[PDB]
Design a protein around this ligand. Structure first.
Ligand SMILES: [Mg+2]
Ligand SMILES: [Mg+2]
Lengths: 143, 49, 221, 178, 152, 99
RNA sequence: UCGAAUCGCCACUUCUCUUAUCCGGUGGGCUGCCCGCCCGGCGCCCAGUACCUUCAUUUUCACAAGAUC
RNA sequence: GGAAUGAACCGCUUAGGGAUAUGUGGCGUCAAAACUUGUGGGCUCAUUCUCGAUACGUGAAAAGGGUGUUGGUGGAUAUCCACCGGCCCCGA
RNA sequence: UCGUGACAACGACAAUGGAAGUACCUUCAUUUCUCGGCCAGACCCAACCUCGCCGCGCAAUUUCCUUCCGGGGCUAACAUCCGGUGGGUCACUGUGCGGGUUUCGAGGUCAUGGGGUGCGUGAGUGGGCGGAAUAAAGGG
């Protein structure tokens, strides 16, 4: 029933949902893990922020074709993520309000992770990095 | 192509609906059971002749 | 291949000490000559660096007299006008293997000549390759997978000895010394191997129990 | 499933006319890869035995015969083949198989290997499931006794296609190339 | 000269094909190349034909007659309980381990890495304290020889 | 046997060895890395001066599997890959990802 | 002087032999079956499985902008 | 475009170019394709012009032989004789 | 046809030639410089082309399956085989075919065209976009 003109319309694969844990495949943060927060209003990129104290990835935009979405999911009902908006990236040494937004989001995200029964294992999991060793076959894996 | 198929044959919608009903699970199991009974009954009656 | 002074000064300026490229060492004992060469030739063309050892233990199907006659027929071909230009008949097992591989390459192009330069062949296991790592085999060219048990085969070293090879006794003496030296060292260094195995068994009793349960589930301990 | 040369039964007759009303109906057994070949063999036999050609005849039925259950049995096949040098040769052979189609498929491959006879030069006269104590071939009767057992030697094992390698380490199973 | 014999009642493991790594019992021999296999207690594994190049014979064997009914085979398996004995073998454990890794979810893969790193850390520590006394490694043996140069 | 066509290239990837395996890599981006002999323009020549070098790359994509053994066919955008690359390294990246 | 392509390493691999062969070795009981006995590794982000702490503005892919020699 | 090579053989017959699929012929290396495919049967061992292996292409061979090995047919007796094939060997 | 300065490299396939790139030159032509007629990436619509998954019709599925007794055979049996008796209402191996709009999990086009809904005379034709309705006629 959703129309293409409506903002809520989107065509992204069903594995990429809020709270999903993804592996970054390209960029300066290649091989690191992060958490998908939301999607931009139109059919735009996703916004990811792995807890910056865990993996070192700040709030950023990323295309859905450059992340591998795993099956591990953290409940995100508590985190509002309403402050995330296209204008924060539209504006062109970090700024004060950007730091405040990052701190607020990280605090809520960390509490949600610890709420999971495997909270400690999840925190260690977010620390790990992914790499292709000699003799690996990523096409045979399940994720 | 769906719109070309319907343009050339306006009966396509009902023909496909018959196929979907043929594939339905409950109806196809009843049809299989009914066929076995009908064939077996005729075999016994013909032999008794 | 011996470095010149220019290479020595450049390495000293930049502080470079040693470098070893990626090389695969193949033990050719009890391998079929034709099938080993065909597999090696393709891998060379794909850009691999290969070193083969123990070339004198290659095997060819058929009796020794049949294969000896085959080589003598090849030895008869020569340029009558000037034999020093004619075909060259190399006699050592490593030279025979290199000739066989060369016949399976585009040898008259620069691409083919480069591929041939990437192969090094030895008789026995020389001292400079003993400590370089574990050797490999080619399962599709092994004797016990290729020949029926009742057939008769020829060992390349014995065939070459009777057509002109002169170093069969030298190679045999060197191999005897290497087996003695390596066997003594492997009898040594067993206390460390046993100690390492004991340490792993001592673990799973001090390490966390949750991680032990995971190892059991995946069949590792 | 494995064997080619399925088991067919073809029923046909000659087209009725006002010299020969109500012609005789014939039944024919044949082993063919498909029913088109099966019908071709039927009309060849009808022509060479009853002077009836496919142009003046009808085919009433052509189906596949169902065999018995799966078990180890002895099959006797009497077969004939032609060659220019010797003419027609007739023989009776025995095989071990689980179905009639399998035994006949074995015979066709055996005749090609041992006598170089192709499919269209071969005629099958019959196939029967005979009991033990009625086999005259030692190479077949050796599988009869109870407590029969033998080992597997000179095996040539191959890995599943997903795990085949080219180079492997000498004292382990670790792959090097591929 | 030492092998498991092919006969009625011998347990085999399938090598390749749709039934790869399954276990069945030989119920009959047809010729030098083919046999009949059945496993009543497992899905699929009804009576079917198998080539002798596609099986491996195991140590266990059941006592049945040639071409026995699926029933009598069932009680024979239950009485001997060979299926349980095979499952406890080391080779069966390795096969199940290989399968479990193929169906992992990449979070258990992280857990397996943590467990393997924890075991390796403790092995290194235990080895080191047992090497301080009774030197074994190259550096401890060399250190003892160099300390013997104490005439200065 | 008649000759070669240089508009399509064949790439062999490690640990694939199967057509079903090669189907996983259809549509992935690849590149061939080499070097020239003087520094020329590159991406982010002004934003990231540390990237300036003699290194160069030629990009392409995987189109379809080749044969039955994991070989794949690659087209390098609008031109051919130079023949000096025969037998050299090719990078196969994991994006665009369908997982 | 040189900006370059290559991207697992180990003093647990880096000894030997066999495949009609105890597939780690090795006995007994009555052909073949049954019953026993003794004994590749690391590496993938806390130098270690605790859950402490720095990563940003390089703001959506681009030769790893980093390593090795 | 194929049969290594060939006016006439096999396929196909032609404006300048992409994608897809085939024909003849092929899938150990040269050389693209079974990284030496099958969870298909048999047969063959061939010492100095060196067993055999793409028709046309005789563009390499006969009469006559073999207790080499592997199959049949007809007779006898609780294994023996006669005859006919397949591959290989002598004739060469 | 020859000399000279500078430069380009080059084994031995006699040179010359064709096709497709690349490394160094050239500064010849054209475009752009706060918008670009440049280079990449992802997304949307149409068209064409693939893959997963789920199925159907037909006496094709009785030269068949099962129980018992009588032979026969093996070893004490069972079994292969032959006559009958009584029952026959997870794969059973042939032959024709289907399935996304009150929706049956995806992919490719650097191998196609788009203004990529902006819009005002630059013709979204759609079971697919709008706005009404709710089993409407047609099957087991
Ligand atoms: Mg090839
Ligand atoms: Mg509508």
């Amino acid at each position: 029933k959703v129309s293409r003109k409506s903002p809520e319309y989107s065509t992204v694969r069903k594995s990429c949902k809020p709270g999903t844990i993804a592996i970054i495949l390209a960029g300066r943060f290649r091989g690191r893990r992060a958490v998908i927060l939301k999607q931009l209003p139109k059919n735009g990129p996703l916004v990811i922020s792995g807890p910056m104290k865990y993996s070192g990835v700040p709030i950023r935009r990323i295309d859905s074709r450059y992340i591998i979405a795993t099956s591990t999911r953290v409940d995100l009902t508590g985190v509002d993520t309403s402050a995330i908006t296209p204008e924060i990236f539209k504006r062109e040494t970090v700024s004060d309000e950007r730091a405040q937004l990052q701190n607020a989001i990280d605090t809520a995200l960390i509490q949600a992770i610890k709420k999971d029964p495997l909270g400690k294992e999840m925190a260690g999991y977010l620390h790990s990095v992914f790499t292709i060793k000699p003799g690996d076959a990523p096409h045979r894996l399940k994720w | 192509n769906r719109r070309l198929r319907l343009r050339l044959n306006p009966f396509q919608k009902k023909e496909k609906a018959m196929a979907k009903g043929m594939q339905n699970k409950k109806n196809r199991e009843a049809r299989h059971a009914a066929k076995v009974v009908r064939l077996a009954k005729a075999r016994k009656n013909v032999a008794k002749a | 291949v011996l470095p010149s002074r220019r290479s020595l000064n450049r390495s000293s300026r930049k502080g470079f000490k040693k470098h070893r490229p990626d090389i695969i060492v193949i033990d050719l004992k009890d391998h079929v000559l034709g099938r080993a060469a065909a597999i090696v030739a393709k891998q060379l063309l794909l850009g691999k660096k290969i070193t083969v050892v123990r070339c004198e233990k290659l095997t060819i199907a058929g009796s020794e007299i049949r294969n000896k006659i085959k080589y003598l027929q090849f030895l008869r071909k020569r340029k009558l006008s000037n034999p020093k230009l004619g075909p060259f008949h190399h006699r050592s097992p490593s030279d025979v293997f290199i000739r066989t591989v060369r016949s399976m390459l585009p040898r008259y192009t620069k691409r083919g000549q480069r591929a041939l330069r990437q192969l090094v062949a030895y008789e026995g296991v020389p001292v400079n390759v003993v400590r370089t790592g574990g050797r490999v085999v080619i399962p599709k060219a092994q004797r016990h997978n290729c020949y029926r048990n009742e057939r008769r085969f020829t060992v390349l070293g014995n065939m070459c000895k009777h057509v002109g090879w002169k170093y069969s006794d030298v190679v045999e003496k060197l191999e005897a010394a290497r087996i003695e030296k390596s066997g003594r060292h492997h009898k040594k260094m067993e206390k460390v191997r046993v100690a390492w195995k004991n340490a792993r068994k001592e673990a799973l009793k001090k390490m966390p129990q949750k991680n032990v349960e995971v190892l059991k589930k995946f069949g590792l301990a | 499933v494995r064997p080619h040369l399925r088991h067919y039964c073809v029923v046909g007759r000659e087209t009725p006319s006002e010299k020969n009303p109500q012609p005789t109906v014939y039944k024919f057994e044949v082993f063919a890869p498909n029913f088109v070949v099966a019908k071709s063999r039927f009309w060849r036999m009808m022509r060479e035995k009853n002077k009836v050609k496919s142009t003046h005849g009808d085919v009433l039925s052509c189906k596949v015969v169902k065999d018995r259950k799966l078990a180890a049995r002895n099959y006797s096949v009497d077969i004939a083949y032609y060659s220019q040098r010797c003419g027609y040769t007739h023989m009776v052979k025995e095989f071990r198989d689980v179905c009639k189609a399998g035994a006949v498929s074995q015979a066709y491959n055996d005749l090609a290997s041992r006598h170089r006879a192709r499919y269209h030069n071969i005629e099958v006269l019959g196939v029967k499931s005979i009991p033990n104590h009625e086999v005259r071939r030692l190479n077949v009767a050796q599988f009869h006794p109870h407590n029969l057992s033998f080992p597997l030697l000179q095996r040539r094992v191959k890995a599943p296609r997903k795990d085949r390698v080219i180079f492997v380490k000498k004292n382990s199973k670790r792959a090097v190339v591929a | 000269v030492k092998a498991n014999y092919i006969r009625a009642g011998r347990l085999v493991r399938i090598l390749r094909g749709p039934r790869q790594n399954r276990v069945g019992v030989i119920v009959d021999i047809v010729d030098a190349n083919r046999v009949l296999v059945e496993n009543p207690c497992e899905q699929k594994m009804w009576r079917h034909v198998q080539n002798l190049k596609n099986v491996e014979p195991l140590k266990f064997c059941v006592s049945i007659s040639r071409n026995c009914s699926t029933k009598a085979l069932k009680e024979a398996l239950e009485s001997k309980k060979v299926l349980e004995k095979y499952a406890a073998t080391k080779s069966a454990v390795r096969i199940a381990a290989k399968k479990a890794f193929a169906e992992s979810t990449d979070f258990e893969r992280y857990q397996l890495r943590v467990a393997k790193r924890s075991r390796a850390y403790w092995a290194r520590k235990i080895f080191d304290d047992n090497d301080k006394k009774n030197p074994v490694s190259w550096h401890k043996v060399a250190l003892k020889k160099l300390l013997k140069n104490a005439k200065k | 046997l008649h000759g070669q066509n240089k508009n399509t290239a064949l790439v062999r990837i490690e640990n694939v060895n199967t057509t079903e395996d090669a189907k996983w890599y259809v549509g992935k981006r690849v590149c061939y890395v080499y070097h020239g002999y003087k520094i020329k323009r590159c991406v982010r020549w002004s934003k990231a001066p540390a990237r300036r070098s003699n290194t160069r790359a030629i990009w392409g994509r995987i189109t379809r599997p080749h044969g039955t053994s994991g070989t794949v066919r690659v087209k390098f955008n609008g031109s051919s890959v130079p023949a000096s690359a025969i037998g050299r390294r090719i990078r196969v990246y994991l994006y665009p990802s369908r997982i």
